[PDB]
Amino acid sequence: SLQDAEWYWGDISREEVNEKLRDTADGTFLVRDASTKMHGDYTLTLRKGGNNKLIKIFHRDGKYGFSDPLTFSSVVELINHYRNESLAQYNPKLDVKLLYPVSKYQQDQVVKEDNIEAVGKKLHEYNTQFQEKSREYDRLYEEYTRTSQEIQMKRTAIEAFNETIKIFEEQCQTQERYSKEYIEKFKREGNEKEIQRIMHNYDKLKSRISEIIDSRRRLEEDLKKQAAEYREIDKRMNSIKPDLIQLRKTRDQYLMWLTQKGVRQKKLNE
Amino acid sequence: PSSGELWGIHLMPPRILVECLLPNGMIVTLECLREATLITIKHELFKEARKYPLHQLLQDESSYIFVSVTQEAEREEFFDETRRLCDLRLFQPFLKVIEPVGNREEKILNREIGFAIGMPVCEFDMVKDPEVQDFRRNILNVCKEAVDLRDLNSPHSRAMYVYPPNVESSPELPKHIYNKLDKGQIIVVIWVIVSPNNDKQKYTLKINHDCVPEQVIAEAIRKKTRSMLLSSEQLKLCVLEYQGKYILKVCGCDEYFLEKYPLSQYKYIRSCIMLGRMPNLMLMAKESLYSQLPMDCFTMPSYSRRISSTKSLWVINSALRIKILCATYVNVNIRDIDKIYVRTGIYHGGEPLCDNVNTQRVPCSNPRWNEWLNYDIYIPDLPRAARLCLSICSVKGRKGAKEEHCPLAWGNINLFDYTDTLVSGKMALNLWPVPHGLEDLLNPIGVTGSNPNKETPCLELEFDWFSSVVKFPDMSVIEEHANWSVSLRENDKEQLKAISTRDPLSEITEQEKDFLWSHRHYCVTIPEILPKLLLSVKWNSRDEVAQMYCLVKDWPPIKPEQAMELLDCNYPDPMVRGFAVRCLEKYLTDDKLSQYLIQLVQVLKYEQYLDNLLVRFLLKKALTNQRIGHFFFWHLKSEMHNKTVSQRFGLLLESYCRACGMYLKHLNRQVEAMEKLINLTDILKQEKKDETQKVQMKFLVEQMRRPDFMDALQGFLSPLNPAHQLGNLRLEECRIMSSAKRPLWLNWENPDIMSELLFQNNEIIFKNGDDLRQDMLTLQIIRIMENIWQNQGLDLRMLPYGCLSIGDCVGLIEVVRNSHTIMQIQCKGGLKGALQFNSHTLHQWLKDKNKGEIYDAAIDLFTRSCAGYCVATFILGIGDRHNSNIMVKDDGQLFHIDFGHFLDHKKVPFVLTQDFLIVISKGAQECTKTREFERFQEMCYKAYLAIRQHANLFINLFSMMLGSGMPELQSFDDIAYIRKTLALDKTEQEALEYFMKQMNDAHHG
């Protein structure tokens, strides 16, 4: 039968099948009833070339098929025919067999006694464990962005210190240039008074250059330490992401045992 | 760009000590005022320098200038010596004396551009990348074209640039507008100022709605010369005198009627008819308008002029292979993550040209591979817009649970560069952070380029080298290959047309797309089908692409609402995008260009290279129409912080500011005004956040009393609408608001000579902390939907109030005067039930504000606007809003507010509360059964299917925003919700019943 077939999911949306053939291998296939919501009209989608390629299953006189010449009796016959041999018969442009089926009620990884608490209790547990680990991820991403812009604020400030220091060092190298042969001329006149005026000013220059050099390393030191904890926030987010996805899918499929009741009473209670 | 007048200091003290370095090695401490101009500094320095050694070496004061370091780390030469010390944005209080070198004017101008765009222009000079340097030079001709074009018929052409006509796209007003005209005529009042005391006199006229402004000036001088006993020719002479001597201006704002569009086509008067208000125009002397248009030049910059064998792709006989060498700076926990690997894919837009390939998995502690990845694609089969998308991924394993893969950092590369050459040799690009919420292992929509941030993961690759430079084949041989490979019907025609109707995101199965490719030649009969046909092309086959290039070369032009789709991320081919641009620059009006400017700026991100046909089109239009150039600037400026586009937009802004003329001076006043406001809110949010709201009120009123502040916040143009002049602040009305981010309620006087005829005081909300581009897009979309309904005849009044994002989570919002929230209005009433507000309180408040004959009008306006927002919010998923999210004017107009606040609360039915039904039914019992409600839901039905009839436009507008970085718009799957509410995969009657059932379930009837 078609309704019980592995690869028939029913009222599933295109965006939902795109989320199920993501990064899968060529040949993975799945069929829905067409998005048109018209009875007895279906669409098959298979992975080929990194793309999800859709094809329409026409229906006429009870027969089936996806071309103007229509043949098969049921879709299960149409599909299994192309599970045994390739569909290059239809179009040589793609020549993969319907290799990997993705079924609706496999991956149902609830193993213990199916007491209704497997929903009312273990679902609320995983969902509580999912929203907590989501709270932490958003907290990390916030201080991650804060730390990100604080770092570049400091990188441009040390770059400013570099220019100021470049400009005070060239000042020293011009003081020695234009004061040398006046110091040398004062020296033989016996005018130590004027020499100490020059040296008193040269000391003043390289005295301040020491202060801005110290202010730079004190900033490079804060930068080095904040750049480090920025990398730690990164690896923590990378460790929380795979876990967060793992228990989000577990919370999602634990609605399977809610679908056991169908009507969403056992979650409306929560 | 500058948090204060000194690094880590908001304001300089009144007197500070400045270390002055002389051209002799003497250092002089100069005490000077905060506000001292550099002319005063330099003069008093060389005056003090005589007290220090080696004065003889100093030349004359006039032969030197100051240089220093800014808080942007720039060694800035202070040529403009008129600037105040505290306006220099100094890093440290010191000044280095040097002899000036280089072009003074160019340096003064670059500083003004740097302040405008938020970064120093010199940073562009240091860029090694030749694409950047070629861009800076090669668009200067677009600047020259625009400047020469607007200085052609001066001063008129110059006035048409600064004050362009604000006109609808069509003079053909619909009949529901025409029916408010007195037998096809309109009444207008013309005002004139007389000098002795600026006293004013008015002249009322009745004229045909389609009179040009000069004819209006003719009817006015004709009405005043009534009794002068003039001959038919003497009347012509003075009519000619006035027609050529005066123009018309809107009373209260800077809008003018400089071109001969029919009067009713000017938006200000198209709405005076719609709203049935009195158009007030001021007769003004043309020589007075041209007086306030100071001549402005455009000078080619220094970089504009000087600078200090191959084989075709289609001869390379080999498949593509790329080498992944090693990675760096990978941040991963070695004990929680098992292994890492590099994932890659060859993409044409968003469709992989071939299956993805991954490097082998590798320990986290040694990110090295040295693998050659082989791709299933023949090098000659590479399309020009082919891109390499890659990422570093991690894996965590388990048996009882599936293995989990996650991306760590991504990066995209153009396999061909901007010169048409195929890349070769080893390459190293720093990768980007994976955006919040994205779980796909790759990000093909992300920008192509290396991350400039340092200490970021750096991946190294190597591309094959084919003994010489390889280039994409010229178009000459491409067409010949099509002639090589290439060597009516009825029932198929109805299906082809049946496919043109389907929206851009509809499912297109394999049988349908290759059916289009088969009849690709018949498709030109229905040019609407092009986007479907392009997605049908197998872009990894040079045979098909070449054949498709010949079809787009002769494709009948489609109209802009359709061409805009071909600029989104699904059409990267440069020939397709060039065809789309040519559709815009010949069919897109400056009105609808200004309407879709948001989306047009965003698709710049999808552009593969800096120099392209789109940016030259937008830049051209921004320099010939200062209205769209104003928002062109702010939409670029608002995203400067984003390093993924900061360079692209920065180079684009440099060229605009370098050729926009005297408007740069005005923009800098706006920028400095916002800079002051954002610095005061940061102080309120970071320093005195713990202080009381009344302590903060003090900091504000006091910091707003400062002369330097008021001089900067008084007398500039409103960024929400440059036509609105913002004069003096009414500090009496200014205040912080109750929100945690504490936005500023600001209020200015309108300095217009006749401000009393429009609005005498203008007030705006400035908010720092919230991302406003969700409100921008929502309000824009609301304005589109209102325009659609009006032109169809539905007089549903929406209120897309002004909203503008000026930067990272900071922007402006237009205040709506005489309006309250429904919550505020319920509190004005009393409790009816047991601790329950009275449902009739809304209806009663509206009666008090609309006594007498005007009562019927208010109920009509409430029912029409309520129907509009009900349909709008349902379609867009805005749905369940709070009574404090919904507002209503004393007029009776209803509108929603704060849409980002709503989307942010999440990260559906529509509101039809009982209180609204009381008003709609005029306070009746079983209000769901009266004939007012009968025709109310009939308005909703017509409005719903009206938007469905233009669903392609909205889906295209949202699709163009996917690269914006808005978390609401990260994938086409996000846009799929609008396909659900509009029910695009169903028929009309099926969507109508879906909307009817939705509305019925709203009131649970």
Ligand SMILES: N#Cc1c(-c2cc(NC(=O)c3cc(F)cc(C(F)(F)F)c3)c3c(c2)C(=O)N[C@H]3c2cc(F)ccc2Cl)ccc2ncnn12
């Ligand atoms: N919220 C919410 C919500 C939704 C709900 C709401 C929304 N709407 C927006 O995202 C949105 C709407 C704008 F007009 C402007 C902007 C802005 F500014 F960001 F660009 C964003 C979308 C979805 C689900 C969904 O799947 N795709 C979204 C979507 C729908 C559309 F029609 C159009 C575009 C998009 Cl992107 C459904 C039920 C429900 N019940 C309680 N809340 N709630």
